[PDB]
């Protein structure tokens, strides 16, 4: 499903993402926007290393979820990558929380550095009532 901006913002708030490990809700919104356009069924195959990015946050199969076909992969989130393609974002959120518990934090996603870091991200949560 494709979330409406404010609809997603209120959902992430409810799932306890605001300020999780020091990451503001507007940052998570900026990340979801650039990674998938708020689309939970988005998948992106990386032919260069044989891995696939899954879901609204575009989480990688090499370390976070298991899809069986990625070489030398681990499943830190202990989830089938299929779980990251549901309309209910609870599992994707639980896994994103795991990703940011590692040293890099939000920096794990290169898109965040390119389009969110050091920018005015207030626009992503404006008018949403969060
Ligand atoms: Na994996």
3-state helix/strand/coil string of the chain: CECCHHHHHHHHHHCCCCCECCECHHHHHHHHHHHHCCECCCEEEECCCCEEEECCCCEECCCCCECCCCCCCCCCCCCEHHHHHCCCCHHHHHHHHHHCCCCCHHHHCHHHHHHCCCCCCHHHCCCCCC
- 8-42: b (≥16 Cβ within 10 Å) or e: bbbbbbebebbebeebbbbbbbbbbbebbebebeb
Sheet of 59-60, strands arranged across: 43-46, 51-54, 59-60
- Cα of 83 from ligand 1 centre, angstroms: 12
**Considering only CA atoms, which of 38, 82, 81 is closest in space to residue 57?**
38
- CATH assignment at residue 130: 1.10.530.10
Please give the method by which this entry was determined: X-ray
Breaks in the chain listed by the residue before each, with C–N > 2.5 Å: none
28 within 8 A of 17, measured Cβ to Cβ: yes
Residues 6+ away with beta carbon under 8 Å from 104:
none
- Cα of 59 from ligand 1 centre, angstroms: 10
Domain extent for 10? 1-130
- Cα of 76 from ligand 1 centre, angstroms: 8
Which of 4, 7, 18, 35 is an active site residue?
35
- Cα of 7 from ligand 1 centre, angstroms: 30
Interior CA angle at 65 toward 4 and 76, to 5°? 115
Whether 53 is a known active-site residue: answer yes
Q: How many domains does the chain have?
A: 1
Beta carbons within 10 angstroms of residue 59's beta carbon? 26
């Amino acid at each position: 499903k494709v979330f409406e901006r404010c609809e997603l913002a209120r959902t992430l708030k409810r799932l306890g993402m605001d300020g999780y490990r020091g990451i503001s809700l507007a940052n998570w919104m900026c990340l979801a926007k650039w990674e998938s356009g708020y689309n939970t069924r988005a998948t992106n195959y990386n032919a260069g290393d044989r891995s696939t990015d899954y879901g609204i946050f575009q989480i990688n199969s090499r370390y976070w979820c298991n899809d069986g076909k990625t070489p030398g992969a681990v499943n830190a989130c202990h989830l089938s990558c299929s779980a990251l393609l549901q309309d209910n974002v609870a599992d994707a959120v639980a896994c994103a929380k795991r990703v940011v518990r590692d040293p890099q934090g939000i920096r794990a996603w290169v898109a965040w550095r390119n389009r969110c870091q050091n920018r005015d991200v207030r626009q992503y949560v404006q008018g949403c009532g969060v």
